[PDB]
Amino acid sequence: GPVWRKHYITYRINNYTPDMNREDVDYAIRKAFQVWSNVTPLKFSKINTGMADILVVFARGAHGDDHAFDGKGGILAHAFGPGSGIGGDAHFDEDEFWTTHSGGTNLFLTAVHEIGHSLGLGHSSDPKAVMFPTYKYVDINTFRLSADDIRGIQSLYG
Ligand SMILES: O=C(CCCC[C@H]1CCSS1)NCCCS(=O)(=O)O
Ligand SMILES: [Ca+2]
Ligand SMILES: [Ca+2]
Ligand SMILES: [Ca+2]
Ligand SMILES: [Zn+2]
Ligand SMILES: [Zn+2]
C-alpha cells in the first residue's frame, strides 16, 4: 500500500476536544508521533496554518468523509493512509471522552494506532501490537511498540 516518499512530515491539529486541556492534546499527539519517529527515518513537525500532511480532527457523526462515526463506544477513531488531500488525516470521535490516563479513552494510545494508519500500516492480529484493532489501556509509561509493530513499520520505511 501507499507510503510517504519524503522524511519531513507535517501535522496540524485542526480543532481540540473539550475533553482535555489544550496542552495535553498537544503533548499526547506529539508523543504519539515520537513513538514512530523513534523507529523510522521520519521527522514530524507541528504547523499552525496551511496544509499539513496529517490533519488531526476531532469530529462526531457524519463529518464530511465516507466514514461516519457511531456515537460513544464502538469506533474510536480512523485514519487515512499516505496520500494527498485527506490522505494521512487522522479523525477522533468526539463522542468518546478523551483522556491523559485510563478514565475514558486514552488519546495517546489511540493516536499511536491512528498515526500508524497515517503512515501506511494496517491492522495486526497480535494482541500485543499497538496496531491490534481493539482498544485496551496500558500505562502510558509502560507502553512499547511490539516486535510486530516495529517489523511492520520498518518494512515500510528505513
Ligand atoms: O482502532 C481504533 C483505535 C483504538 C486503538 C487504541 C489502542 C489501545 C492500545 S492498542 S490499540 N478504534 C476503533 C476500534 C476500537 S474498539 O472497537 O475497541 O472500541
Ligand atoms: Ca492529508
Ligand atoms: Ca464511537
Ligand atoms: Ca468528547
Ligand atoms: Zn473521518
Ligand atoms: Zn485501526
Side-chain angles (χ1 to χ4, degrees):
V3 294
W4 298 107
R5 300 305 187 184
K6 59 201 182 168
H7 296 314
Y8 297 90
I9 304 302
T10 66
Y11 70 101
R12 169 183 194 182
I13 300 170
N14 174 75
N15 62 303
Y16 282 85
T17 177
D19 299 355
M20 297 178 54
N21 299 317
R22 180 193 188 90
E23 71 200 80
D24 297 331
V25 180
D26 284 350
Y27 187 77
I29 296 302
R30 175 177 176 96
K31 291 295 282 181
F33 277 108
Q34 289 173 20
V35 165
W36 296 108
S37 57
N38 289 164
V39 297
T40 60
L42 302 169
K43 286 274 183 169
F44 302 102
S45 301
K46 182 176 165 290
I47 68 188
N48 294 343
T49 50
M51 182 266 314
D53 296 309
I54 298 167
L55 187 71
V56 172
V57 182
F58 290 88
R60 52 164 52 81
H63 53 279
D65 63 21
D66 211 18
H67 297 245
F69 287 135
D70 56 357
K72 184 178 187 97
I75 289 169
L76 312 173
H78 63 243
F80 299 91
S84 59
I86 197 166
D89 298 356
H91 303 168
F92 294 84
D93 193 351
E94 193 58 83
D95 291 331
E96 316 314 332
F97 186 63
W98 301 100
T99 185
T100 54
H101 47 73
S102 65
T105 304
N106 185 265
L107 184 54
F108 166 74
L109 293 165
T110 309
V112 175
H113 174 101
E114 297 313 318
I115 292 164
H117 296 307
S118 294
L119 299 181
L121 294 174
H123 285 152
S124 174
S125 56
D126 183 338
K128 296 170 232 64
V130 78
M131 297 311 300
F132 193 67
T134 83
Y135 177 88
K136 180 185 40 58
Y137 181 69
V138 305
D139 185 347
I140 51 163
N141 307 313
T142 307
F143 170 73
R144 304 280 191 280
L145 297 176
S146 77
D148 186 66
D149 298 310
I150 294 174
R151 283 197 320 274
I153 203 72
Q154 289 181 172
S155 88
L156 299 175
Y157 299 96

